[PDB]
Structure formats: structure tokens, C-alpha cells
Design a protein around this motif. Structure first.
Motif, short mmCIF file in Angstrom:
data_model
loop_
_atom_site.label_atom_id
_atom_site.label_comp_id
_atom_site.label_asym_id
_atom_site.label_seq_id
_atom_site.Cartn_x
_atom_site.Cartn_y
_atom_site.Cartn_z
N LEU A 1 0.64 -1.17 0.18
CA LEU A 1 0.12 0.02 -0.07
C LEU A 1 1.04 1.43 0.09
O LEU A 1 1.44 1.30 1.08
CB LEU A 1 -0.78 0.03 1.36
CG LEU A 1 -1.56 1.07 1.68
CD1 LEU A 1 -2.55 1.57 0.50
CD2 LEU A 1 -2.47 1.24 2.91
N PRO B 1 0.00 5.02 -1.42
CA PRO B 1 -0.77 5.86 -2.23
C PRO B 1 -0.17 6.97 -3.06
O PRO B 1 -0.55 6.98 -4.51
CB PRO B 1 -1.84 6.42 -1.38
CG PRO B 1 -1.81 5.63 0.08
CD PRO B 1 -0.34 4.89 -0.10
N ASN C 1 -2.10 -0.20 -4.40
CA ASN C 1 -3.05 -1.01 -3.18
C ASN C 1 -3.38 -1.97 -3.68
O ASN C 1 -4.32 -2.36 -4.18
CB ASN C 1 -4.29 -0.04 -2.94
CG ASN C 1 -5.01 -0.51 -1.91
OD1 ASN C 1 -4.68 -1.41 -1.14
ND2 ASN C 1 -6.03 0.22 -1.59
N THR D 1 -4.23 -6.07 -4.09
CA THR D 1 -5.09 -7.15 -3.66
C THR D 1 -4.14 -8.51 -3.77
O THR D 1 -3.34 -8.74 -4.59
CB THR D 1 -6.41 -7.31 -4.41
OG1 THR D 1 -6.24 -7.59 -5.69
CG2 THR D 1 -7.15 -5.99 -4.36
#
Ligand SMILES: *[C@@H]1O[C@H](CO)[C@@H](O[C@@H]2O[C@H](CO)[C@@H](O)[C@H](O)[C@H]2NC(C)=O)[C@H](O)[C@H]1NC(C)=O
Ligand code: NA
Lengths: 35, 64, 257
Positions: free
Chosen positions: C46, C48, C53, C55
């Protein structure tokens, strides 16, 4: 067991500690503790 | 995350003044020849991630 | 790894490579802490500023790997779940930069695949002193910059370097970034004789120390961030694993996990 197997033997390498064999530079690490 | 030299004016999260990061809330004005860089207050654009190493053999299909 | 050398076979059997699934590329290092748990940096999952981000569907890990083909020995695993520390602060220069990845299925251990230990109170008390050396390993760049292409600095085999812990006042005076108690720094001082650092692609991977008391390797740090790689008067920064051990245990011990 949500951690799974491996905690009891953690940190002992099959090709090193388990065979009582040292790797090529770990001596440098112990020297830093002593010297 | 390794911060590396800013490569365009207006970037941030990159090394601007010497080996110091120019953080969020600031932006790098890159000096031309004989000018110093300056990290000034303002909205900057993070320097993008460098090309990841994709020079490995392709892994088989099972692993979608 | 800058100023490192090729790791012996089986040197770091806890080493993990985190890969993007498509396109297939190395993202970060990581480490195996049991047959089903992997530890890495939060910023590998993660971040930004890069609109990152991930999965579980986006990633794979590789364990047991020594060198780029130029066999039966590496394991490729999918992930079941990602856990990022609840107080990871990417605005606060990556404070609490730690994440756990749960493997889809428990893996078999082998001569090349074996977990590292996590420190307890006594381990941290015994080993975390300025000047004691630990060991960083990874598949990242061998230099910060290159002339022609990045392939110039990519290693064919896992690299290793040993680096000393640095006193906290020296760490803090080396940068204008605010250093918290959840970080430590390591590396040589200018004119100490030797050099070395982690670099891009090594982030997430382990800083380990060997206990003389029980002959076991402990992961004391996670490669977290640096201003450049191997610059004189700069040091690499590492997540302080022991300081965040209560969160690791919480996650692992949760009934669902
Ligand atoms: C990163 O993406 C995740 C989604 O994968 C965001 O997380 C939460 O995730 C769940 C599951 O998708 C969603 O229900 C919500 O979006 C969030 N949780 C709830 C129920 O409140 C996460 O917010 C993203 N983070 C950033 C900073 O982009
Ligand atoms: Na340095």
C-alpha cells in the motif's frame, strides 16, 4: 495452530546450523559482538 | 522505498537539495547549469516508481 | 544490494520474493516466518503516492530461489490474505512499515525453504547494540544509478551484505526526516573502510542477526526506506520488528487467521 508449523526449529538452516557448518561471512557478525 | 534524484521540476518524494528528500507538501525546482535545486512549499508530483525487474523466466499457467 | 556478494546456496532459506502476477515482475523482498506466514513492508502493498494498493489476486510469492535461469527447488505460492499494520503511516515517512501475508496453503520445508525466528524481549536486549552487525539480503539493484539501462545493475543470484547497527543520534543527524522508535538505521560511516546498503527491489526483505546464545537467526528489521543507496553519510532505515511484535502476534493468533 494459526501460526502453523515451523516455530520450534525456526532460524536453524538445513545447510548450515543443522550440519554444524558455518557460512562464508557469519564470523564477521560474531566478531562485531566480541571485538 | 528509495528516494532517488528528482528528474523533472515539480516532482517530490525524490532527492532535491543534496541527499535530502523533498517531501509531500513541497516540490523540487531543478536548477539548470550552475543553479542549485530548491525544495519549495507547493504541490508536487511523486517521482514515479522505476521499472520493476521483469527479467525472470515466465512462471507456469497454474499460477494465473 | 549495493556492495554485496553472491549468497551461498541455502544461506537465507527464509528469503521470499514478492512478484506482481501480470506483468510478472519483482516488487519487493519478504521473509518466511512459518510454513504459512510471510512478513514484508507495508509500503510494498500500500503506497498511495504511486496509486499502489494491491489485492491478493495481483501477487505471487517465490520461496527457495537462488538464481536466474541463464529447478525442483523453488516454490511459487498464491496469497490468501493481506494484513497491513493498523497504524501504518505512509504520510509519516512509513512509520510502522510492516505487513503480513497469509499463504494460500501451508508449504513444505526443505534444505532451501525454512522460516526465520522473530525476536523476543531477551533477543532484542542482547543483539540491538550500535556496532553489532546484521545481514541484509535481496534481489534489488546493485547500484543506485546506471549509465545505459537498469538491467546493468540487476543481479543473477541473491545478494547479501553485512552492515552494523548505528547509534540513534547518528541516524537522526544523518537526515531531516523524522525518525521514530519504530525504525532503526544501519550501515558504515564514511571512512570506516567498507560500504554497502539495500537498494531498489530489496524493500520488504529481512535484516537478520544470529544469536550466539542459541545459534539461531532472528529477523530484527525489514528494509524500509533510504535517501539514495550507499551514499556517504547516509544510512538505510529498517522497520523495528521487535517493537511491532505485539501486532504480529495479534494477527497470527486471531481465530479466523
Ligand atoms: C485499498 O483498497 C482496499 C480495498 O481492497 C480498501 O479497503 C476497505 O476495503 C473493503 C474491501 O474491499 C471495502 O469494503 C472498503 O473500501 C474498505 N473497508 C470498509 C468496509 O470500510 C482501502 O481503503 C484502500 N486504501 C487506500 C488508502 O486506497
Ligand atoms: Na551510507
Amino acid at each position: 495452530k494459526t501460526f502453523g508449523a515451523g516455530e520450534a526449529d525456526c532460524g536453524l538452516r538445513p545447510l548450515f546450523e543443522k550440519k554444524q557448518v558455518q557460512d562464508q561471512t557469519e564470523k564477521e557478525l560474531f566478531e562485531s559482538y566480541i571485538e | 522505498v528509495v528516494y532517488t534524484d528528482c528528474t523533472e521540476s515539480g516532482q517530490n518524494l525524490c532527492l532535491x537539495e543534496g541527499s535530502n528528500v523533498c517531501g509531500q507538501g513541497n516540490k523540487x525546482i531543478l536548477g539548470s547549469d550552475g543553479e542549485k535545486n530548491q525544495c519549495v512549499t507547493g504541490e508536487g508530483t511523486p517521482k514515479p516508481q522505476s521499472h520493476n525487474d521483469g527479467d525472470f523466466e515466465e512462471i507456469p499457467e497454474e499460477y494465473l | 544490494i549495493v556492495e554485496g556478494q553472491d549468497a551461498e546456496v541455502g544461506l537465507s532459506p527464509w528469503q521470499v520474493m514478492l512478484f506482481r502476477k501480470s506483468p510478472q515482475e519483482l516488487l519487493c523482498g519478504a521473509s518466511l516466518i512459518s510454513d504459512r506466514w510471510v512478513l514484508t513492508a507495508a509500503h510494498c502493498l500500500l503506497y498511495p503516492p504511486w496509486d499502489k494498493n494491491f489485492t491478493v489476486d495481483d501477487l505471487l510469492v517465490r520461496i527457495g530461489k537462488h538464481s536466474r535461469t541463464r529447478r525442483k527447488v523453488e516454490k511459487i505460492s498464491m496469497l490468501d490474505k493481506i494484513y497491513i499494520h493498523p497504524r501504518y503511516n505512509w504520510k509519516e515517512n512509513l512509520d510502522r512499515d510492516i505487513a503480513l501475508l497469509k499463504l494460500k496453503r501451508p508449504i513444505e520445508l526443505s534444505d532451501y525453504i525454512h522460516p526465520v525466528c522473530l525476536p523476543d524481549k531477551q533477543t532484542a536486549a542482547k543483539l540491538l547494540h550500535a556496532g553489532f552487525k546484521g545481514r541484509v539480503t535481496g534481489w534489488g539493484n546493485r547500484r543506485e544509478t546506471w549509465t545505459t539501462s537498469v538491467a546493468e545493475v540487476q543481479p543473477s543470484v541473491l545478494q547479501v551484505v553485512n552492515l552494523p547497527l548505528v547509534e540513534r543520534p547518528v541516524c537522526k543527524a544523518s537526515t531531516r526526516i523524522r525518525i521514530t522508535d519504530n525504525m532503526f538505521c544501519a550501515g558504515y560511516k564514511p571512512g570506516e573502510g567498507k560500504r554497502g546498503d539495500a537498494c531498489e527491489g530489496d524493500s520488504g526483505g529481512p535484516f537478520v542477526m544470529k544469536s550466539p546464545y542459541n545459534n539461531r537467526w532472528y529477523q530484527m528489521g525489514i528494509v524500509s526506506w533510504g535517501e539514495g543507496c550507499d551514499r556517504d553519510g547516509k544510512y538505510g532505515f529498517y522497520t523495528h520488528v521487535f517493537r511491532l511484535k505485539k501486532w504480529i502476534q495479534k494477527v497470527i493468533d486471531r481465530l479466523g487467521s
